[PDB]
Subunit: 314 residues, 4 copies
Amino acid sequence: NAKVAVLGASGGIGQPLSLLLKNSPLVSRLTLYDIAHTPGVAADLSHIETKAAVKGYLGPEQLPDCLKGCDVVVIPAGVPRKPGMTRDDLFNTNATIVATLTAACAQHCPEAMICVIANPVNSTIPITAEVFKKHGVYNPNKIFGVTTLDIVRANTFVAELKGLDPARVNVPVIGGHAGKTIIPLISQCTPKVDFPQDQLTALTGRIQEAGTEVVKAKAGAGSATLSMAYAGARFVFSLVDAMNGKEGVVECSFVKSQETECTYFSTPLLLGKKGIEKNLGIGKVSSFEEKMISDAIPELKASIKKGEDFVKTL
Amino acid sequence: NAKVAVLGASGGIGQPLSLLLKNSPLVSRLTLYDIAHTPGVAADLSHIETKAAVKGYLGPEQLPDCLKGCDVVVIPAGVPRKPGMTRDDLFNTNATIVATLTAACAQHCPEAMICVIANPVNSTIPITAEVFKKHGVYNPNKIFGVTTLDIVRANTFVAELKGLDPARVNVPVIGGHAGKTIIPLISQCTPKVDFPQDQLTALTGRIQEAGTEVVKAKAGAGSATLSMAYAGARFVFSLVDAMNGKEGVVECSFVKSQETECTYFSTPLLLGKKGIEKNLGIGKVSSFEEKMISDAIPELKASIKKGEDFVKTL
Amino acid sequence: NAKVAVLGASGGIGQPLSLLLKNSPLVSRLTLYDIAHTPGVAADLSHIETKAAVKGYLGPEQLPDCLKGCDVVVIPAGVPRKPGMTRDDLFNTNATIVATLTAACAQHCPEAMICVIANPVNSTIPITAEVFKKHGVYNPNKIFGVTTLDIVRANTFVAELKGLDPARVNVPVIGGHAGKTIIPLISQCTPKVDFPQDQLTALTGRIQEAGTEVVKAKAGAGSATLSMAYAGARFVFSLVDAMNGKEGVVECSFVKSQETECTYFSTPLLLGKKGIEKNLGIGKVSSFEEKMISDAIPELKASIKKGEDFVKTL
Amino acid sequence: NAKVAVLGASGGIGQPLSLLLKNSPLVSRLTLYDIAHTPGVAADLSHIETKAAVKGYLGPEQLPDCLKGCDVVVIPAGVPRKPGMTRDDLFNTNATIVATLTAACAQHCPEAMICVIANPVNSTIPITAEVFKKHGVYNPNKIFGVTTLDIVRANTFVAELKGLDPARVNVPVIGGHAGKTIIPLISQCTPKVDFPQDQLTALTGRIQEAGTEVVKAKAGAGSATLSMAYAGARFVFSLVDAMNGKEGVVECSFVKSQETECTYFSTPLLLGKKGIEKNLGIGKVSSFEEKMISDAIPELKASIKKGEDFVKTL
């Protein structure tokens, strides 16, 4: 009976993500928010033969109604990358979008789980946390930077190389969601896979630049939308299952962390009724992986500080 | 091991449809075709952690490679309606789209199931049949006008009025997919439901005008996309399940028919390995429903004739 | 110093039309209406260094304010053709667009000049007249079907074949704005030009199908936008000049006519203070041109009737 | 008699820009380039009754033929801003677009006037100059960063505040084309205008933020298009008049400069037959304006080095 709000529901990620949420038996209310086209999207989705009651909200003054009583808020809202761009090129747009939307959450559903998809996640999660702090409703266990697409890609690519079914493969991916901050722990993969170093390096790079590959392939028509909707759905389903009492629910996510010198970090998380039940940490890693962690730290801390300073100067 | 082709995979219906197909363990090869954007849509979907091999195809030259060895072809391609349009207003443009694509189907995958979403279905299915006849590969058991969205809508509206879970409501809808040719058999609904006659007439009008309601609500930005993808995906899944020998799979679909004086007509169909296992027919209906059947036949015959005559001139 | 309203200012025709009107010293006030994007379009245009005051209006609630005190209303609003479509395929959409917008003109600026670009013009002008008759403010001297693009095309194609400067070529085109109802009076061309009948026939058919040529060239991205904006601007400028007292201003336009048995017809019109100052008629024509007039009359009457019938069913 | 090329002719700026150029008796040949839609845009424009011959070009193979013999090349190509972005945020996409297109210009029309609209102009002109240096054909009197829209805005806003005819207002705007680098010299306005301080300050800021105000007004649907087309056309016309021997033609533009320590800077330029006849420099300015020049220099230098560093890493 979860009520889930989707902020940015009319966008490229928003529309398919809303479809996947509408199709789920875990959702009973699905409220949709955007600044255009939301009523047509809700009308469209409300015809689908599932129990979730759908409502489309349009414009800032309707945002409180969309958020009230929400258990989960997903935020796919944001401008997508075009060819050549870094995710940080979209910092200024998406930071103001994330700060505005998360401020509305802090006021109107402070208790809800906040799942941020909007990039750069390495900065937008710090932004979300600081905004909740300013409203005095800060709960580190309920703020999630959705990195699930990195895990999803890692599983697919390992499966392809080893001729496995991607559904049966699980690769923990830690760090953050940008370039070399994306650290796939192939040493912790289930099933165990043995790659020689040249293939491991090629596989790791592929995972790290996978978003850029899609941007390139779309040749100006944006970034990952459909696979991001899949990954976004997956994480929200994991979270809702855990909120309903399902045990042993583990997902990697970029959260307020105590695992490294970074105040924010993605690790495997045991999920439960109050969000993060336990941070499972990095665990045992190879020299290759340890070296990637070390090299990721400066960029992560820089991205965190940029997110923090953006909010603190509002 | 279903090899599925989606013709029009980059459109508003095509993209979320391809996503849902990619998410299913029934599909092992997903080939996507359009005149633009397909490599990007394919790159996007190829990252999802399911077994389906995704491949994008672009331009008439690559159409035969997209269709090579396909078991099923779904055709979401077509110009969508704007407010104040009938589906028949799109006949002229969509008829030549369908005739071109179905011709390629008859040349390169004549044995495949052909699932036409492209509207107006009442005319475009006849076009498909005639095109297949011109290539001498006509199988009436394998050509389906996807009307599933009318059933999905009927199920949802009945469920909302009776306070039921729409996932366990089943309303047969017969006739065709246009205005008063859409005939919901509320009398055959399971579980059994009873409305006062005035409420029945309102429910029935709503179901008939449901497509238009979404068009109006989208205010010029096209017609149903997400619900149409859900409905198209459900039909393909039903069909593919039956092809794997699943029993008791029933879907309404606009097909070659000997149930009325209309050469094509939609009724509940038992699906099997060959395609249509058995047309389950119209069955016992109310006087109200029999009145609607009688009223619809003129329009259907005109739509069928229109489609047949179009193929005459090629 | 005319106040000019553009209804459908955000569309493909409307934006560049609005630009050309904004650039003209004949326009002191420019009001822009649409259902989306108008505020942005007006903000954009308001930065241009000309005297015209620009204001954007969004949605029906702001439509009366847009029309208040207008001297001219230009109506580029309307759905454009795609490959394979006829202009009549768009009758249903554009007929209800024109009916809604002209009804607002009748109520809020009944004395304004009404310039309809919305196709098919052969029907939408009858619709406009009947809608104005319903409101009891019908003035047939102020209602114009914009056929100017036909004249502009004929001038260009004649000039290209004869190696002339198009600016010095004037070709009267009479009849209507669709297919074989478009009748270029090459015998009345200035300067005088001689063509062999096979060339004349080719030239004539080129003019008649010139819109279809552009729709083909755009391959799904719509119909003439930029050349139509030029033609609409030219007609509005001619009309406004004439309203300011300029003498000898002649433009062909589809209007209430008694030049033939067709109740509406396009001929050269002397424009002036009251709009249509004088209908100059068909004049002297060749036997070839005479044949075309006769061949065209049946389609014109059908299109006129079709438009009148549509208004009665409201 | 001028031959003008437009690179990016299918975009929001390109199309209305192409229309304005086609409408001008100064243009005898108009060549249009883009990676999509150019044949349709060209077909559309070719119907207009002006002497300019219009040809559409499509794909890398045809770019050289678009450019050969050109007197002027205008480059509106590029991704536009969305609300909350700086122009600098688009650097990583538009840098490689400008690099590629200006390399083609240096190869196929090195003696043409190169007019870069593509933003951020403060960085993309340095790119253009470095690309021309690599090809050994760098002429600083023929490369122009198009800042004309800033002047057009300044003229309009000044005219609105004082109740003047904007056609009679000419405000010099110096520096560059981004936020605080845009420096309107109101002290040098003709006619001479006196503003109280609070209006002067609000006027100056309005001019500096004018781009963002249009982006905000468009609510995600891009940046200025129609006014940018106007401004780009005006600049091309000024250049062409000067090439035709007209005296006293002065335009501000961002060019190679020795006015400040910035290697590129915008000042009023006397234009001649070979492009820049004479840089008229900053001249006498107020203390308020001198401060704005001081404040602008650090940002310009960083934007300049960024453009230079981009080319050095190819």
